[PDB]
Amino acid sequence: LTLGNTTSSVILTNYMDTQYYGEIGIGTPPQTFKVVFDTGSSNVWVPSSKCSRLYTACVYHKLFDASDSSSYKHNGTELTLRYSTGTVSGFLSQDIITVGGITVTQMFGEVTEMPALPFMLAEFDGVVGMGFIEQAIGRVTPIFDNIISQGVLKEDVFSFYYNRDSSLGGQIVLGGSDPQHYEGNFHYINLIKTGVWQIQMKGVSVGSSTLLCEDGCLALVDTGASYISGSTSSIEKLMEALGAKKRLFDYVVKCNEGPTLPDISFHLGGKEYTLTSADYVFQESYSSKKLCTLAIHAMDIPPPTGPTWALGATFIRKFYTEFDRRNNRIGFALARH
Numbered sequence: 463l464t465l466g467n468t469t470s471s472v473i474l475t476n477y478m479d480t481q482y483y484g485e486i487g488i489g490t491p492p493q494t495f496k497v498v499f500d501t502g503s504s505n506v507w508v509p510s511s512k513c514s515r516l517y518t519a520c521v522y523h524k525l526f527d528a529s530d531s532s533s534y535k536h537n538g539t540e541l542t543l544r545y546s547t548g549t550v551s552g553f554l555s556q557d558i559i560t561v562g563g564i565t566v567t568q569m570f571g572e573v574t575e576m577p578a579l580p581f582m583l584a585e586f587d588g589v590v591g592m593g594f595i596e597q598a599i600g601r602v603t604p605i606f607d608n609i610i611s612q613g614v615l616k617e618d619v620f621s622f623y624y625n626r627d628s629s630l631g632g633q634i635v636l637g638g639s640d641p642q643h644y645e646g647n648f649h650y651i652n653l654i655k656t657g658v659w660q661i662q663m664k665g666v667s668v669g670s671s672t673l674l675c676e677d678g679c680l681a682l683v684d685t686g687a688s689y690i691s692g693s694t695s696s697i698e699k700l701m702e703a704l705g706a707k708k709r710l711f712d713y714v715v716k717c718n719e720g721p722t723l724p725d726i727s728f729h730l731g732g733k734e735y736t737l738t739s740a741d742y743v744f745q746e747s748y749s750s751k752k753l754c755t756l757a758i759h760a761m762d763i764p765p766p767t768g769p770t771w772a773l774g775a776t777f778i779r780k781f782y783t784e785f786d787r788r789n790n791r792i793g794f795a796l797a798r799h
């Protein structure tokens with residue numbers, strides 16, 4: 463029973479400003495997993511005990527042991543995800559998942575097949591998709607949908623705070639926002655359509671001049687992405703405008719110049735969201751002989767979602783983000799650290 467004022471929160475660990483994860487329990491008694499909570503996908507994945515020790519990504523992560531949960535219920539429906547370095551596959555199962563003290567009976571994918579890269583470099587063990595049912599593999603009801611159907615949470619919204627690496631690493635609130643991690647007020651932008659946390663963008667400004675995305679473009683708000691990302695060509699333009707020169711997959715500046723780079727502005731719902739140099743350069747060193755990388759990368763996202771920009775941890779660290787299902791909209795407020 464609720465009296466209409468209940469929320470719950472999940473505390474996150476920050477790994478290298480690139481991976482932000484919380485812990486959830488699966489089964490009875492609970493088996494614990496480190497998971498990334500990801501607004502750009504809608505399925506729950508964890509590695510299965512039936513994953514072969516010939517898969518290097520399985521060898522060094524927590525595996526889910528179905529035989530040890532009294533509440534597990536067999537399903538077996540094969541599941542497939544194309545990933546750009548190979549195919550990940552596994553089977554469907556059902557059990558009880560515990561998140562922020564809430565218990566939910568949930569379908570999830572047990573992974574039995576995984577490329578070694580990039581998955582062996584994950585600090586976390588799995589993924590909890592916070593996207594819409596419309597994009598769920600095998601159309602299974604996502605975890606937040608199940609949570610809502612309980613009618614326990616104050617509002618049909620969840621929010622994300624991501625800290626700079628140092629101190630709380632981040633926090634997800636289910637059913638509200640935490641006024642301690644943001645300042646001032648929320649502005650909201652409506653979603654282009656239901657089924658994806660994607661909004662319209664009206665311009666990207668270096669300095670005081672709109673250098674990109676006039677005539678508009680799309681922005682995916684992806685809590686699971688490490689960086690702000692754009693199309694190859696867009697990023698070329700932005701980088702050649704910054705003095706940044708291409709390494710292998712990175713763009714680099716001289717660590718002494720970094721602190722004098724220009725602001726980048728994102729124009730979203732008639733408000734300008736500005737990142738300064740301190741927000742987008744990894745300043746490992748303030749030295750004239752060293753090379754510093756930028757938290758902005760190139761990426762070309764396939765249809766139907768793309769071509770699109772993606773506003774990942776780099777953008778979220780600056781702006782506390784509220785994801786509003788009741789009104790199909792996203793709100794931003796300046797985060798406080």
Ligand SMILES: Cc1cc(Cl)c(OCCOc2ccc(C3=C(C(=O)N(Cc4cccc(C)c4C)C4CC4)[C@H]4CNC[C@@H](C3)N4)cc2)c(Cl)c1
Pocket residue numbers: 480481498500502503507508509519523543545550573580581582583584585586587588589684686687688
């Ligand atoms: C160790 C391990 C790692 C993972 Cl990702 C896992 O889940 C298997 C499901 O596969 C994926 C699920 C989601 C994603 C997504 C994303 C994605 O790239 N992810 C993987 C990721 C992110 C950062 C750093 C590393 C090393 C990795 C592996 C997962 C969200 C964390 C991003 C970017 N693209 C769109 C969405 C979806 N958001 C990519 C792969 C399992 Cl079962 C085990």
Ligand SMILES: *[C@@H]1O[C@H](CO)[C@@H](O)[C@H](O)[C@H]1NC(C)=O
Pocket residue numbers: 467
């Ligand atoms: C909801 O609970 C919070 C607990 O911090 C309390 O401060 C607030 O007054 C409550 N609001 C309502 C609607 O009663």
Ligand SMILES: *[C@H]1O[C@H](CO)[C@@H](O)[C@H](O)[C@H]1NC(C)=O
Pocket residue numbers: 536537538539554600602
């Ligand atoms: C799980 O698989 C069962 C067979 O055991 C299938 O009939 C069912 O649709 C699956 N659950 C869902 C809701 O996808």
